[PDB]
């Protein structure tokens, strides 16, 4: 998610939105922190002895490292038996007062349920949660995940993300078709028009997860610039730009592995190359550039004389497509859109665009392609 | 001379000039808003003029069995109100202002109207003024409309209906009086001519500083008790007592140790840790040294073993002994402690993070009976909504917060003939109360 809004760390300046990055004046503020994550410890014994550290330091920033902290402790595997239905018969007993009438109602309670008790008591509330292996986290590098983190928290009121393109931009689109991300670009400076989770309605929470997986490559590259521009009030709204460039104290940490999975181009690939013999497949093709707009399809196809490009679209908007189609009518070619049915709100029907729900139904690319050769 | 002095329309007129009154020429007459009533007849007959007037045309009293026995605090604010019939009284949430408002009805016996803000306040006052009075009462307001010698309407309708009520009722009634000073509701007062009101309040100061206008609108305050005022030895309905026990000798060796590291440390820099100016100077050295970190850790830890000693579930468990048959909630400040006293005696816990569900559980089995006794948090939660205990246990705590103290007031007001309050306390610690 990044960090709750609660969290969120930042100040406004005329138009601009200045993030308050963690910095090496910190660095106390996070070993002593860092210090009270040890294996066999309740989290709820770290709430309190961080309290006095809430009066020296920003409580804003302590929490958030202690959230962050906790999120690379693993903990001990949920209770057997619902820990709720374990207190109900429990403390059915009243107050027990002997220490052996206590012994004994623990046992009776812990051959009635069949579990240690005890152990799993109160192992659904987060205070006594108890750590077994303590994260690894150096100070240094808390700092910079924190400062990712506040990154990604403030993205996801973003109405738009320009990306500004160093080097590996053909490695950029790629994660970001891989993520499904909406986009365009344009090449005035070569750049992308990430659209953000505020142009959503219904599923910004996934976007959004999927959009900060991409700021990771991006600011691993040796130049990049991002200029944000967020929305804030819910019904005065002002848009507030967020620049920054080259900012090297970040750093992921969330592995995230196996979330971006190019199923769908491929399968796609397979089933037309085999399916379809009269059109010669070119996949990933020279983008297009028409008045300053590139066009980055996916598969060029062509049969002798007609030339036709699919591009693949994972999420989408009622009102993207309608952009994307709009600037595509001067593209000067057909092109066939694959929308996918499941990462919209409205069921959409066009004259160049097949629908697909898991995977591309080569079948209706097929009938599409002959229902205009003629 | 024969001065005469009428009602017309939420105004005062008279055939002569007294002061406050101001001639009409659209009217012929010296006039004012009619709550300048009691004040120029008064002027008048104090200067032995004949008062012709028809000024007050009272609907009739009705019929009343006064049921209210007053406690003694809201006796005393009754005799306060009572020497000028004209007065705010400012009593906390839950100090039964209601019931001192009642009780000046019955003594008075005229007719009432009682003004309040929201349309859950008209039927609250209506069902206390049924137990308390036996009258069901007119009520103007939320859609009903009728009108009785006792009767409930909303500030907006009394602002609706001033000029035909100006003049029907002797006592006015402004309950949550505060609201009176606002833009609508000032000119509202100004249109009665009621000689006798009452305003209640637990929040008489304004932002906007328009309480000044309280003697003009409703009278000014004439009895004021805070709600620590209200939980003294001698005047709260439960016995305060604090049992106190000694540190585990460990304890007091860790707490010793850690007093003297704090006290070296202060001594060797020229700080002392008297006064809150004094801790906010040690908090801001701790930013940036960490010798200056370590003692305010070393005041939080020593502090830490006083206030959650072992020896208090020692002694909580002596206390729950005595008490069998009572219905016992014990309060901690922080989570953890509430969690140790739930494992040792197998009794259900409430804090800030139980889920709803859950916590509306605990407290209802706690309600009904079959939970005699829990323990709760108080770190960011209020203690409110709690049902009736009769015994509670306090464990630790920087004092009591006025809340909680208001909140444990309403939670033993409840509990019994006699119900107590017990503080357990260690002893050779050292005070932390900063100033
Ligand atoms: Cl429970
Ligand atoms: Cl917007
Ligand atoms: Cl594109
Ligand atoms: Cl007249
Ligand atoms: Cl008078
Ligand atoms: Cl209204
Ligand atoms: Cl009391
Ligand atoms: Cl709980
Ligand atoms: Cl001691
Ligand atoms: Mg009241």
Known sequence: ?374 | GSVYLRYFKGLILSDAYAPGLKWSDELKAYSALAFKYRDVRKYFLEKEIEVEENVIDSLPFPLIKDKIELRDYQAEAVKAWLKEKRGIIVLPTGAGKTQVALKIVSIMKVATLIVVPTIDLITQWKERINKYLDFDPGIIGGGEDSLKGITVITYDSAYTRAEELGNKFPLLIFDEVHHLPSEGYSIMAQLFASPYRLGLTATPERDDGKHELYPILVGPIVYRKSVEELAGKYIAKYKIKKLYVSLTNEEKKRYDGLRKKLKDFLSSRGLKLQNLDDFHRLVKLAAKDKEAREALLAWHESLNIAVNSQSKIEKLREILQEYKNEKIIVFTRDTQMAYRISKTFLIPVVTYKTDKDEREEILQKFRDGEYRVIVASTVFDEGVDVPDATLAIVMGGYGTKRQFLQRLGRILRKKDKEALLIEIVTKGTADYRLS
């Open chain 1, 1 to 374: 998610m990044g960090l709750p809004w609660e969290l969120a760390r930042f100040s406004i300046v005329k138009d601009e939105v200045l993030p308050h990055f963690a910095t090496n004046e910190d660095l106390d503020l996070a070993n002593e922190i860092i210090s009270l994550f040890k294996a066999g410890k309740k989290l709820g014994e770290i709430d309190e002895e961080i309290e006095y550290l809430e009066k020296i330091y920003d409580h804003k920033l302590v929490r958030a490292f202690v959230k962050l902290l906790t999120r690379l402790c693993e903990f001990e595997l949920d209770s057997p038996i619902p820990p709720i239905q374990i207190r109900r018969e429990l403390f059915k007993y009243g107050p027990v007062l002997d220490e052996k009438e206590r012994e004994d109602i623990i046992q009776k309670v812990s051959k009635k349920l069949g579990a240690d008790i005890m152990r799993f008591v109160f192992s659904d509330l987060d205070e006594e949660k108890k750590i077994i292996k303590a994260p690894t986290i150096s100070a240094e590098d808390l700092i910079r995940w924190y400062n990712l983190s506040l990154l990604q928290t403030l993205l996801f009121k973003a109405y738009k993300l320009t990306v500004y393109v160093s080097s590996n931009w053909k490695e950029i689109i790629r994660r970001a078709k891989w993520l499904g991300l909406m986009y365009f670009a344009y090449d005035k400076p070569l750049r992308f028009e990430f659209l953000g989770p505020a142009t959503l309605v219904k599923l910004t929470e996934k976007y959004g997860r999927n959009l900060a997986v991409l700021l990771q490559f991006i600011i691993s590259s040796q130049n990049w610039k991002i200029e944000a521009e967020l929305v804030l009030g819910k019904k005065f709204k002002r848009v507030y730009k967020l620049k920054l460039a080259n900012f090297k104290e970040l750093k992921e940490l969330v592995i995230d592995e196996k979330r971006f999975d190019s199923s769908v181009e491929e399968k796609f690939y397979k089933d037309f190359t085999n399916v379809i013999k009269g059109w010669k497949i070119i996949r990933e093709p020279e983008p297009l550039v028409v008045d300053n707009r590139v066009f980055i399809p996916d598969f060029l196809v062509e049969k002798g004389n007609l030339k036709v490009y699919v591009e693949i679209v994972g999420f989408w908007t009622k009102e993207y497509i309608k952009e994307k189609l709009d600037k595509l009518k001067k593209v000067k070619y057909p092109i066939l859109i694959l929308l996918n049915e499941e990462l919209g709100k409205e069921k959409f029907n066009g004259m160049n665009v097949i629908t697909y729900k898991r995977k591309i139904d080569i079948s209706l690319v097929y009938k599409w392609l002959r229902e205009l050769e003629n």
